[PDB]
Amino acid sequence: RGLGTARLQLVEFSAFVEPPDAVDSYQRHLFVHISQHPPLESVDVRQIYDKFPEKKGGLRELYDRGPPHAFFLVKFWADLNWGGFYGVSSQYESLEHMTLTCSSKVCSFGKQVVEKVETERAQLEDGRFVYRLLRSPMCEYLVNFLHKLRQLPERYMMNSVLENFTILQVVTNRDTQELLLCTAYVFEVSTSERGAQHHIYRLVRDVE
Numbered sequence: 001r002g003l004g005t006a007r008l009q010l011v012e013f014s015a016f017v018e019p020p021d022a023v024d025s026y027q028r029h030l031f032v033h034i035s036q037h038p039p040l041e042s043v044d045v046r047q048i049y050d051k052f053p054e055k056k057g058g059l060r061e062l063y064d065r066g067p068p069h070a071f072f073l074v075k076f077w078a079d080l081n082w083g084g085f086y087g088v089s090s091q092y093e094s095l096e097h098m099t100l101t102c103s104s105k106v107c108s109f110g111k112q113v114v115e116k117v118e119t120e121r122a123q124l125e126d127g128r129f130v131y132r133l134l135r136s137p138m139c140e141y142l143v144n145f146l147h148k149l150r151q152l153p154e155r156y157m158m159n160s161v162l163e164n165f166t167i168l169q170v171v172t173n174r175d176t177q178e179l180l181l182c183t184a185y186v187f188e189v190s191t192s193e194r195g196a197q198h199h200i201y202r203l204v205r206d207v208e
């Protein structure tokens with residue numbers, strides 16, 4: 001129905017830039033945004049194996065580890081129409097008290113180029129636990145990437161570059177090493193006039 005299981009739901013995800021201005025009058029630009037404050041379409045995981053690494057922490061090894069219902073594909077239309085602060089903010093919820101490990105991998109032509117690993121202990125909210133990874137500074141690699149992408153002279157060239165750029169997020173129970181959520185991200189640029197959009201799929205593999 002949405003990005004999440006009964007065990008862990010994504011409330012909100014965004015990657016953004018706050019101009020130096022923002023101290024005077026506060027602005028933020030969203031490169032991409034999901035808020036989850038009708039069942040999903042499905043995509044065969046086999047069709048995207050090669051956009052991600054092989055061996056450990058590759059999509060095939062992770063899917064075999066399971067559980068299979070925990071795997072999602074997000075297609076983003078990134079808004080690239082904008083020395084500020086580059087940030088990433090993630091919020092999850094559960095009925096269960098856990099310590100999460102959240103691993104984010106950037107891949108270029110299916111190869112790992114940069115990885116960020118964060119742990120977040122649960123905090124009590126109104127009849128649920130919340131995991132708040134807010135305003136995490138964007139790594140130099142992606143800030144630099146976004147500045148270059150911004151400057152290409154055609155949208156189709158931006159989309160051709162993004163064809164070979166993916167992100168894999170794996171959220172695990174730090175204590176039991178159970179996988180809770182695995183999200184593969186693929187990317188296109190939005191038009192000049194349109195903001196960030198996404199489509200969420202279930203990732204499936206034929207039992208057959």
Ligand SMILES: CCCCCCc1cccc(Nc2cccc(F)c2C(=O)O)c1
Nearest residue numbers: 015078104105106114115116138139187
């Ligand atoms: C074309 C638009 C790209 C938007 C990317 C948004 C996004 C989406 C998801 C995660 C991240 N961050 C990372 C991802 C992987 C490894 C990392 F080091 C980072 C990090 O910044 O530390 C960033």
